[model samples]
Target: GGAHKVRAGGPGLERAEAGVPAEFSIWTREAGAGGLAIAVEGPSKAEISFEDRKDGSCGVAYVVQEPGDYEVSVKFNEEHIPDSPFVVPVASPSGSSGSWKVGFFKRNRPP
Candidate 1:
């Protein structure tokens, strides 16, 4: 409980699409207290995976096959992150035709 640090990003706040992988990253700053834990609840539950990165961070990826709301719960050292249990909105792949048009507008921009 001394000088512990944790940070996370990605998928938690971004909109997701059905049948596509949704991912996020976590950085513990080497707290060494415990490992990360992730849980997902939604119209369709998909198994989550962890990939340890060499840069002192971890990547979590999962997929949801139904279009609806999904909750992502992240924990570190068995405790919930400050902003744990983020709500993510999922859209049907076929219904994102308008978004695809917007995507083309930024096609020339470097990701």
Candidate 2:
């Protein structure tokens, strides 16, 4: 809604399917340091316990275990960041008619 920090995922990675690798990032221009917590409501039951980060966002890769809806979350010193609890939807199997689309990406995109 307003100006804020914390951007989930790098770019074009709003959604990820099961059994794949994904990248989620947390960006903050504010001073101080804190950890970003990542939890998945669906899939093979995953949890990240207050992993701290400084200088940059997301120091790990999201590995898909089970397919379904993945809920992404992030926190700083016990406060819930905006746009968090982000939803990452895994696509259907390569048949049936389910489709996927790109979320946030560079306007000029790298070629």
Candidate 3:
């Protein structure tokens, strides 16, 4: 089967500056069976889950407390899918672009 295509939107906030919120969006070909899960990795790690809607799109927003390179992972079925798990390096003053890429897993194993 062909892999589903998903795009991560802008970091959505200015880095270095406090009180700025971070957000990202994801779009799938069709509504997935399981909900979407987001994981942030940096100085600390955190995970959150959102229900997938029939609209085939979902997004999440959060207030970044610390400024650093955050590894954002979006997973389906508790595993990282293709074109997912991107890195968003939060820079100061917002609108700053940083290097980021998604990580891949060999198998569709659960974490």
Candidate 4:
């Protein structure tokens, strides 16, 4: 057999920031039982399951360790998904671009 082609993926939140946990999934319904490979760079590898993909469920999970651009690719039965490769931006929390601090001072009222 040739191999099943991955049709859909990208489960969980599509966007995340540094130190936040993110997850991903792959669908190989078209493709029968097979293996999966995630071609990622830094902080490589997204943990996922294959055997339980008979009904298009289960997904990969990983932590967005740092703030940077990450690309995710999934292969089904050795065949790469058409839109397998996707880019996600890992950055700091929205609005909190940098360190910030707030201070309050008390003034002595009329004694």
Tell me the tens digit of each residue's lDDT in model 1 across 1-111: 411366678964477888888888877655554545677777675656767675667777877767887777766656667677688898989733211100000011111
lDDT of 3 by residue, 56-110 (tens): 6665555444567666676665556565556666555553444333232222211
- Give one digit per residue, the lDDT tens place, for model 2 in 7-97: 5554214877565666655555451344434455554554232222545434445655556776665555444577766787766545233
Best by TM-score: 1
The total number of steric clashes, by the backbone 3 Å criterion, in model 1 comes to: 0
Worst 10 residues of 1 by lDDT: 101-110
* Model 3 error, position 8 (Å): 3.6
- What would you estimate as the lDDT of candidate 4? 0.49
Best by lDDT: 1
Give all candidates' CA lDDT scores: 0.64, 0.49, 0.49, 0.49
Task: Output the lDDT of residue 83, model 3.
Answer: 53
Q: Where does model 1 exceed 4 Å of error?
A: 1-4, 95-111
RMSD of 3: 7.9
The digit string of per-residue lDDT tens for model 4 on 1-111 reads 323355555542366666655665555555545555555433333332323443555455556444666665555545656765566666666623432212111211111
The true-versus-predicted C-alpha distance at residue 39 of model 4, in Å, is 3.8
